[PDB]
C-alpha cells in the first residue's frame, strides 16, 4: 500500500490560551512544510541531521509498539497506548491523565491558521496551563529556507489506493525520558478527531522533556522519512514484534550516507553523491502487410481481415473538431490544383476534357475510396506527369488521325486486366525492396517541385501585369484581364505573403504555452482556415482593385457538348475504330500502370511508415485494386483517371496529428474526413457565391505553407542542413558517430547528384522516362553503394527504423 | 591552508604470511584511493557513513589525547601512547608487550605492492602470529567506485611548507573495547613511516577487536576527513585539552547533512538541497576563525563645492586611451552605419515639420549642423560616449507652444530663445555647483521601466501612423490621372506607391529579424557567422535599396537633404542673432519673464537625460568603465545653450537611438552578455557623417523613405527585450503552470503580481491619455508624480518583502 504521512505537534494560539495539535509538514511525494502566514512552502527531499537519527535510534530501541490493535477511533488508540505505556514503566501512573488529555485535544490544520491569528509551539504542564519553553526558540532551518486549486491538486497526487500514517510529536515536562508509541490498526479506520484524505493505518506518538541534542521536530521528520521509504513500510506491514522493526531500522541506517561540511561549490558537492547513493540503494534492495503467400489472391484477403474489423473505430474516431478543420484545409488543398489542371486540360485538348469532368471524377473516386478503402487518409487526384502523358497521347492521336477520348477507354480496359493479373499474384511485395533512399528522394523532389510551381505562378502573375508608368482604363475585363492592371500584382503578393505569415505564426502559436491548453490547441488546429478567412475578408473589404478569383463551371455539363456525350460508344464515336489500335493500346497502358503503381505505393510508404505510430492496419493490394478499377471505370464514362497525391496525403496525415510535449502521440484515422471532402468537392458547383469571392493569390500562401511544412521529417534535408554546420554542433544521432563526417558528406553529395539528374531529366521533353530512372535508384542502393561504403556504415545511414539502428 | 594526510592499515603480504603497515588512501584537500592493482584512482571529495561517525564519536569522547608531545621517533611515540593507555585503564598491562612489537614494524607504501603480491585485511592476536578474520568481509565502496600522473600532482599540491598527519589502523583480538590515541608532536620531525619528505605533526592510532557496525577502514577515512576540514585542523592546532576537540567534533556533527535511502532517486530533487548545504557551510564557518574558500558611488553627496564634477572627471578620464583603442573592431563600423541612418531620418522628419511650423525661422540645415556639432563635442569631451543627442517630440510640442505664444503677444521668436538659453545656462551652472544630481538615486526601476516602455510604444505608434498616412495619400482606386506634376511633391493619388512602400517596409523588417535570429544560430564558422550577423541591418538596407533602385517606373518617396549650408529663411534671419533686437527692440518685462519657459525646458531636458543615462548605464549591462552624470548633463545643456546662441535648436539625449546604439556594441555569449564595446570613435564618426550628409546628395537621394520604417519597427521591437514589466505582461497570459523561476514569481502570490502589473498598466494608459490631451507639456510633471506613488501608496497595499522582490533595483540580486 502507498502511504500518506502527516506530522502534527502541540501548539498554542496567541488569540486564546488553548493547546491543540497543528500540522507542520507532509510527505505525500516530497516533504513540504507549513509557514507562519498559513501557506505551504515548496516540496523538497527530506534531509536529516546526525543528532536526529542518533536520538531516533536511541529512543526507538526501547520504544513501545502496539501491532494489530483493534480500534476504530483516536480515543481508543490513545487509551490503549497509554495503558501499554503504563505497563512497561515508560511513564508514571500519575502522568497518565495529563498525557491522555493532551493526546485527545483537537487537531487543527493549515486552513484555520489565519482564523487563529498565528500559532507557536507549546509544552504540556502538570497544572494544565502552558508556559513558554526554557530552551532556545530559534525557528527551524526548513521553515527559514522553504517558507518565507491546492486541495484538488493534493487529492490528485495522492494515489488511488493508499493508507494514511499519523505522527504526533510533543513536549511534556512531567516525564523523565523520551517515550515513543507505535501503533498499527487491524484495518484502516477514519479517525474522527484527526482528519486526513485517506484512512489511517499506523500511528506514531513522540513525547519527552527538554534534552540536549534532541530537537523533536527533527525527530518527527526522521520518523516520517522512515515511514516514507518503500522497504521500511513493507517491513512495517509484515512485522509482528519490535525486533523486526529494529532489524529494519538497522538496515535503514546501513544504507544512509553522510555529507560532511565541504568547502567545494554546492552543486558539485551535492551531485557527486549520485553514484554513491545509487550504489547504496542497490545494496539495500538486494505479421507483414506485404508478404509472399502460397495462395492465390492471398494479399487481398489478408488486408481485408486486417483492416475491416476496425470499421466501427474508423467511424467513431471522427467526432473531434480537428477532423472538421482538416476537412476544411484539405478541401481547398485538393480543389485548387484540381481547378488549375482542369483549366489546362480543357485548353489543351480543345475542351474534350475540362474542369467538370475532373471534379466529378475526383468526387466519385473520393467517395468510393473513403467507403471501401483500407487507408482513408490518402487523397486521390490528378498529377503533373499524368498531364504530360495526356498531352503526349492527345498529340499522338492527333498526328495519326484517330480519336482521343475513345482510345482512353481501351487503355482503361488494358489497365483493368493488368491490375487484376497483378493483384492475383500479390505482386505488391516488391514494395519491400524500396528502401528509405527512394522515399526520401521522391518526397524531397515533390515538395521542391511544388514550391517551384508556386513561385512560377507568382512570377507569371508579375509578367502578366508589369510595373509601368501609365495604364489604359477603357479596358474590358469580362473574359480575362487584358493588358496590365495597376495594383493587382502587388496586392496578390501582399495577400500571399500575409497568408503564409499568418499560417506560420499560428502553427508556432499552437506549440507555445500562452493560453489554456484546450483552447490553445483548438485555436492552433484551425490555423489555416482562420488565416484563409482573415485574408478573404481583407480582400472583400478592398473595393476598387482587381484580383483573380476562383471560378467553376456553371452546371453539371460536359466541357464540349459538340463532339461528346455522357456515354462513349466503344466501337466508334464518329468514325469506326481500327483493329490494330485496339490491340496495340496496351503499350501506353503499361506505362500508365507503372506510373500509377509506383506513385501510389511510394505515397502509401511515406504516409504509412512504421515511425508514425499507426495502430490500425493499412492495406496495399486493396488500395491498388480500388484506385485502378475506379480509374478504368471513369475512363469508360469519359472522365479522367486519378492517383494518390503525395503532398495532399502528407498534409492530410500531418493535420490529423495530436502531439505531446515535441512527441507525436496519436494520429486520428477515420473515414469521415475523406467522405466529407469528396462530398464538398462534388457539391462545389452549388457553392458559386462563396467560391467566386475567394482570390487565387491567397491559396498560394497555403501552398507555400504546405510545401514548407511537409519538409520536416525528411532526413536527407537534415543531412543537407548539416552540410553547413561545423562538426562541433552536429546532433546526437547514430549516423554521426558511426561514420566519419566527410563520408556522410559524400553520401549526401551522391544523393544530391541523383536529385539533380532526376531534375534535369524532368526538364527534358523526355519527361515520361522519369519513372525508369527512379526505379534505377533501387539497384544503385543494392549494388553500387556496397562497393564504396561498408556494411555497418550503410546500415547506419539508410536505416529503415529511426529508433532502432 | 592545506595539509597532507596518510592512512595506513595492518595487512598481510600474499607471498609469505607476515604483518606490515600498508597505506590505503591519501588526502590533499581531496581523497585518493588505491586498489589491489597499486595505482591510485582519480581524486574526489569524501563522503563518510553513519556508522563510522557514530563509532568515531563514541571512541573519541573518552579517547586519550597527548598534546605537544616532545618526541621524534615512532618508538617513543608508541611507548608513550601505550603507557597513557595503561594509566587510564584502557588496556591491560599484559597487552603492551604485544602492541608495541605490532606498532614498531616495517611500513610499506604503494610502490612496493607488485613486488610483494598484494595485501589482505589482517587481525593481530595475543600470541603474535597472523590469522584470518572471523567475521565476514565485503568489498569496500570507494575502492569499488573510484579505483575501477598521480605522484606528480600529489607532490605539486602539497604546499612547500606544511605538516602532515598519520593514521594507523589495525585489529587486535586480545582487547576489550576500541581505543583511540591522538598525539601532536611539539616540533614536527621526520618519521620512518612516511616516505614523503613532508614532516609530521599529528598522529592517530586506532586499535580494537572485531565487532559489528565497526569498519576500521571507514573509521580511518572518517578521521582523515575530520583532519582535512579546516576548522577542526585550526582547533587541533590550538586546542590545549580534550574538551576543545570534543566541542569541535560536536560542531562538525551539528552542521552535517545525512540523507536516508529513498525509493526513486533523481538528479533533480537532489539539487533542491543546494541552499541548505550553503547554510550548513555558513553555520560551520559561523564559529570558526577560518573563512570559506568558495563563498565610491557615481552619485553621492560630497562636502565640497563642485565635488561631483571632479569625481566624474577623475573616474572617467584615466580610461581615455582605452576608449580610443577599443574602437578597432568592425562592430564599431557596423554600429556607426546603423546609428547614422537611425539618427538622420527622424532628424530630417522633425526638421521639415519644424520648418513648416515656424515659417522656416528654423529648418533642416540648422538641426543637422546642431546635431553634428553637439555630437562631435559630446563624443570628444563626454563621459558616456554611447549617448545619441537629438531632437525629440515633447521638445517639438514646446517649440509649437512658444511659437504660438510669441505670435499671440506680438514678439519675435528666434530672439526669445536666446534669453531662454541664457537662463538655462545659469540654472545648469547653479545645479552643477550644488551637485544636485544625487536626486537620481530616488528614481527606482519603476519609473525607468514605465518610461522606456512608453517611449518604445509611442515610437511604434508613430511608425504605423506614417504608414497609414502613406496609404491615405495614395488610396486604392480604379483610375488615376497621369498628367500630374510631381516637381514639388506628388499631387493626387498614384497607382502603385502605397503597396510598393508597404512591401519594401515589410521586406526590410523581415530581413532584419531573420539576420538577427541567424546571428545566434550555429550554421556557419563562428567568426564569419558573427561578422555577418552583426551586419544584419546594413546588409538588409543595401539589399532593399538595390531592390528599389532596380524598379524603374514606380514612385516611392526618397530621402532629401538641403542643398547647401544655408539658413532656412534668409529674409528675417542671420547666422548670428543680435540680442538687443533684430527688427524691433526687445522689451524689459519679457527679458525678465522669459525665465518661466526656461525652467520647464530645464526640467524636461534634465529628467529625460538622467533617465536615459540610467537606462544605458545600469549595472546589469556589464558596463566596466565608469559613467558620469554631472558632466554629461553639463555638456548637453551647455551645447544646447550655445546652439540657441547661433540660432540652431537645442537637443537632448535620445532613448531609442541610445538603446539601439548600446545594443549594437554588445558581444553576447552562447545567454550571457560577455562584454560591451565602449569607445569614443563611433559617436564622433556618426556626428561627422551627419554633418557631412549635405555632401552625399547623390547617394542619399536614392534611399526610399519606406525602407527606414522597417528599421524603425526593428529598433522598437528589439529595444523591448530588457523591460521587466513587458515580461510580466507576457506572463499575464500564460497559465501559472509555465511561469519562470525568477524570484518575483515564487515569492509573491499570482494575483498580487497581477495587481502590480495592472496598476502599472493603468499608469501607462493615464500617461498616454495625458499625452494625447492638448495639455501635453504637463506630461513630465505627471511622470515624476509616479515617484511618490511608489514611495507612499504601494506600501499601503503590499508588504515589504513583496515590494522589494517586485520592484528590485538589481536584477540578479533580489
Ligand atoms: C469542340 O469540339 C469541336 C469539334 O470539332 C471543335 O470544332 C470546337 O472548337 C471545340 N470547342 C472548343 C475547343 O471550345
Ligand atoms: C520668411 O519670413 C518672412 C517673415 O517672417 C515671411 O514673409 C516669408 O514667407 C518667410 N519665408 C519662407 C517661409 O520661406
CSV table of C-alpha atoms in Angstrom, one decimal, chain B residues 241-442:
chain,number,residue,atom,x,y,z
B,241,UNK,CA,42.9,19.6,26.2
B,242,UNK,CA,40.2,17.2,25.0
B,243,UNK,CA,37.2,19.4,25.7
B,244,UNK,CA,38.0,21.7,22.7
B,245,UNK,CA,38.4,18.8,20.3
B,246,UNK,CA,35.1,17.4,21.7
B,247,UNK,CA,33.4,20.8,21.1
B,248,UNK,CA,34.8,21.0,17.6
B,249,UNK,CA,33.5,17.4,16.9
B,250,UNK,CA,30.1,18.3,18.2
B,251,UNK,CA,30.1,21.4,15.9
B,252,UNK,CA,31.2,19.3,13.0
B,253,UNK,CA,28.4,16.8,13.6
B,254,UNK,CA,25.9,19.6,14.1
B,255,UNK,CA,26.5,21.2,10.7
B,256,UNK,CA,26.4,17.9,8.8
B,257,UNK,CA,23.7,16.6,6.4
B,258,UNK,CA,22.7,13.0,6.5
B,259,UNK,CA,20.4,11.7,3.8
B,260,UNK,CA,18.5,8.4,4.2
B,261,UNK,CA,17.8,5.8,1.5
B,262,UNK,CA,15.0,6.6,-0.9
B,263,UNK,CA,12.9,4.7,-3.5
B,264,UNK,CA,13.2,6.8,-6.7
B,265,UNK,CA,16.3,8.9,-6.6
B,266,UNK,CA,16.6,11.7,-9.2
B,267,UNK,CA,19.2,14.3,-10.0
B,268,UNK,CA,16.5,17.0,-10.0
B,269,UNK,CA,15.2,16.6,-6.4
B,270,UNK,CA,18.7,16.0,-5.1
B,271,UNK,CA,19.6,19.5,-6.3
B,272,UNK,CA,16.8,21.0,-4.2
B,273,UNK,CA,19.2,20.9,-1.2
B,274,UNK,CA,21.7,23.4,-2.6
B,275,UNK,CA,20.8,26.4,-0.4
B,276,UNK,CA,20.7,24.1,2.7
B,277,UNK,CA,24.3,23.0,2.1
B,278,UNK,CA,25.3,26.6,1.8
B,279,UNK,CA,23.6,27.5,5.0
B,280,UNK,CA,25.2,24.5,6.7
B,281,UNK,CA,28.6,25.6,5.4
B,282,UNK,CA,28.0,29.1,6.7
B,283,UNK,CA,27.0,27.7,10.1
B,284,UNK,CA,30.1,25.5,10.2
B,285,UNK,CA,32.2,28.6,9.5
B,286,UNK,CA,30.0,30.7,11.8
B,287,UNK,CA,32.1,30.0,14.9
B,288,UNK,CA,35.4,29.4,13.1
B,289,UNK,CA,38.4,31.7,12.9
B,290,UNK,CA,38.7,30.3,9.3
B,291,UNK,CA,36.9,31.6,6.3
B,292,UNK,CA,35.5,29.6,3.4
B,293,UNK,CA,37.4,29.5,0.1
B,294,UNK,CA,34.3,29.1,-2.1
B,295,UNK,CA,31.6,31.5,-0.9
B,296,UNK,CA,32.8,55.0,-4.4
B,297,UNK,CA,29.4,55.9,-5.8
B,298,UNK,CA,28.8,57.7,-9.1
B,299,UNK,CA,26.1,59.7,-7.4
B,300,UNK,CA,26.9,60.9,-3.8
B,301,UNK,CA,26.6,63.9,-1.6
B,302,UNK,CA,30.1,65.4,-1.1
B,303,UNK,CA,31.1,68.1,1.4
B,304,UNK,CA,32.8,70.2,-1.3
B,305,UNK,CA,31.7,72.6,-4.0
B,306,UNK,CA,31.6,71.0,-7.4
B,307,UNK,CA,32.5,67.6,-6.0
B,308,UNK,CA,30.5,65.6,-8.5
B,309,UNK,CA,32.3,67.2,-11.5
B,310,UNK,CA,35.8,66.4,-10.2
B,311,UNK,CA,34.8,62.9,-9.1
B,312,UNK,CA,33.4,62.1,-12.6
B,313,UNK,CA,36.4,63.6,-14.3
B,314,UNK,CA,38.8,61.6,-12.2
B,315,UNK,CA,36.7,58.4,-12.6
B,316,UNK,CA,36.4,58.6,-16.4
B,317,UNK,CA,39.3,60.3,-18.0
B,318,UNK,CA,42.0,57.8,-16.9
B,319,UNK,CA,40.3,55.5,-19.4
B,320,UNK,CA,40.7,57.8,-22.4
B,321,UNK,CA,43.4,55.8,-24.2
B,322,UNK,CA,41.3,52.6,-23.8
B,323,UNK,CA,38.3,54.4,-25.1
B,324,UNK,CA,40.3,55.4,-28.2
B,325,UNK,CA,41.8,52.0,-28.7
B,326,UNK,CA,38.8,49.7,-28.2
B,327,UNK,CA,37.3,51.0,-31.5
B,328,UNK,CA,39.4,48.8,-33.8
B,329,UNK,CA,36.7,46.1,-34.2
B,330,UNK,CA,34.4,46.0,-37.3
B,331,UNK,CA,31.4,46.0,-34.9
B,332,UNK,CA,32.1,49.7,-34.3
B,333,UNK,CA,31.8,50.3,-38.1
B,334,UNK,CA,28.5,48.4,-38.2
B,335,UNK,CA,27.1,50.3,-35.3
B,336,UNK,CA,28.2,53.6,-36.9
B,337,UNK,CA,26.5,52.7,-40.2
B,338,UNK,CA,23.3,51.7,-38.4
B,339,UNK,CA,23.0,54.6,-36.0
B,340,UNK,CA,23.8,57.1,-38.8
B,341,UNK,CA,20.5,56.3,-40.5
B,342,UNK,CA,18.7,55.8,-37.2
B,343,UNK,CA,19.6,59.3,-36.2
B,344,UNK,CA,19.4,61.0,-39.6
B,345,UNK,CA,15.9,60.0,-40.5
B,346,UNK,CA,14.0,61.4,-37.5
B,347,UNK,CA,16.3,64.5,-37.8
B,348,UNK,CA,15.1,65.2,-41.3
B,349,UNK,CA,11.4,64.5,-40.4
B,350,UNK,CA,11.4,66.7,-37.4
B,351,UNK,CA,13.4,69.4,-39.2
B,352,UNK,CA,10.8,69.5,-42.0
B,353,UNK,CA,7.9,69.7,-39.6
B,354,UNK,CA,9.5,72.5,-37.5
B,355,UNK,CA,10.4,74.4,-40.7
B,356,UNK,CA,6.9,74.3,-41.9
B,357,UNK,CA,5.6,75.1,-38.4
B,358,UNK,CA,7.5,78.3,-37.6
B,359,UNK,CA,7.5,79.7,-41.2
B,360,UNK,CA,11.1,78.5,-41.8
B,361,UNK,CA,12.6,80.5,-39.0
B,362,UNK,CA,14.4,77.3,-38.1
B,363,UNK,CA,14.6,74.4,-40.5
B,364,UNK,CA,16.5,71.3,-41.5
B,365,UNK,CA,20.0,72.7,-42.0
B,366,UNK,CA,20.1,74.2,-38.6
B,367,UNK,CA,19.0,71.0,-37.0
B,368,UNK,CA,21.6,69.0,-38.9
B,369,UNK,CA,24.5,71.3,-38.1
B,370,UNK,CA,23.5,71.5,-34.4
B,371,UNK,CA,23.3,67.7,-34.2
B,372,UNK,CA,26.7,67.3,-35.9
B,373,UNK,CA,28.4,69.8,-33.6
B,374,UNK,CA,26.9,68.6,-30.4
B,375,UNK,CA,27.7,65.1,-31.4
B,376,UNK,CA,31.4,65.8,-32.2
B,377,UNK,CA,31.8,67.7,-28.9
B,378,UNK,CA,29.9,65.2,-26.8
B,379,UNK,CA,31.9,62.3,-28.2
B,380,UNK,CA,35.2,64.2,-27.8
B,381,UNK,CA,34.6,65.5,-24.2
B,382,UNK,CA,31.9,63.3,-22.9
B,383,UNK,CA,32.0,60.8,-20.0
B,384,UNK,CA,29.5,58.3,-21.5
B,385,UNK,CA,30.1,58.2,-25.3
B,386,UNK,CA,27.2,55.8,-26.0
B,387,UNK,CA,24.5,58.5,-25.9
B,388,UNK,CA,23.0,60.0,-29.1
B,389,UNK,CA,21.8,63.6,-28.8
B,390,UNK,CA,19.0,64.8,-30.9
B,391,UNK,CA,15.6,66.5,-31.1
B,392,UNK,CA,12.6,64.8,-29.5
B,393,UNK,CA,8.8,65.1,-29.7
B,394,UNK,CA,7.9,66.9,-26.4
B,395,UNK,CA,10.6,69.5,-27.4
B,396,UNK,CA,8.7,70.0,-30.6
B,397,UNK,CA,5.5,70.4,-28.7
B,398,UNK,CA,7.1,73.1,-26.5
B,399,UNK,CA,8.5,74.8,-29.6
B,400,UNK,CA,5.0,74.9,-31.1
B,401,UNK,CA,3.6,76.4,-27.9
B,402,UNK,CA,6.4,79.0,-27.7
B,403,UNK,CA,5.9,80.0,-31.3
B,404,UNK,CA,2.2,80.3,-30.7
B,405,UNK,CA,2.8,82.5,-27.6
B,406,UNK,CA,5.2,84.8,-29.5
B,407,UNK,CA,2.7,85.0,-32.3
B,408,UNK,CA,0.0,86.0,-29.9
B,409,UNK,CA,1.9,88.5,-27.8
B,410,UNK,CA,3.4,90.2,-30.8
B,411,UNK,CA,7.1,89.5,-30.0
B,412,UNK,CA,9.8,87.8,-32.1
B,413,UNK,CA,10.7,84.1,-31.8
B,414,UNK,CA,14.3,83.4,-32.5
B,415,UNK,CA,15.3,86.2,-30.1
B,416,UNK,CA,13.5,84.9,-27.0
B,417,UNK,CA,15.2,81.5,-27.4
B,418,UNK,CA,18.5,83.3,-26.7
B,419,UNK,CA,17.3,84.5,-23.3
B,420,UNK,CA,15.8,81.1,-22.6
B,421,UNK,CA,19.3,79.7,-23.3
B,422,UNK,CA,20.9,82.2,-21.0
B,423,UNK,CA,18.5,81.3,-18.2
B,424,UNK,CA,19.2,77.6,-19.0
B,425,UNK,CA,22.9,78.2,-18.7
B,426,UNK,CA,22.6,80.0,-15.4
B,427,UNK,CA,20.3,77.3,-14.0
B,428,UNK,CA,22.5,74.4,-15.1
B,429,UNK,CA,25.6,76.1,-13.6
B,430,UNK,CA,23.7,76.6,-10.3
B,431,UNK,CA,22.7,72.9,-10.3
B,432,UNK,CA,26.1,71.5,-11.1
B,433,UNK,CA,27.6,73.8,-8.4
B,434,UNK,CA,25.4,72.2,-5.7
B,435,UNK,CA,25.9,68.6,-7.1
B,436,UNK,CA,22.1,68.3,-7.3
B,437,UNK,CA,22.1,65.1,-9.4
B,438,UNK,CA,22.1,62.8,-6.4
B,439,UNK,CA,18.3,63.0,-6.6
B,440,UNK,CA,18.7,60.5,-9.4
B,441,UNK,CA,19.0,58.0,-6.6
B,442,UNK,CA,15.4,58.2,-5.6
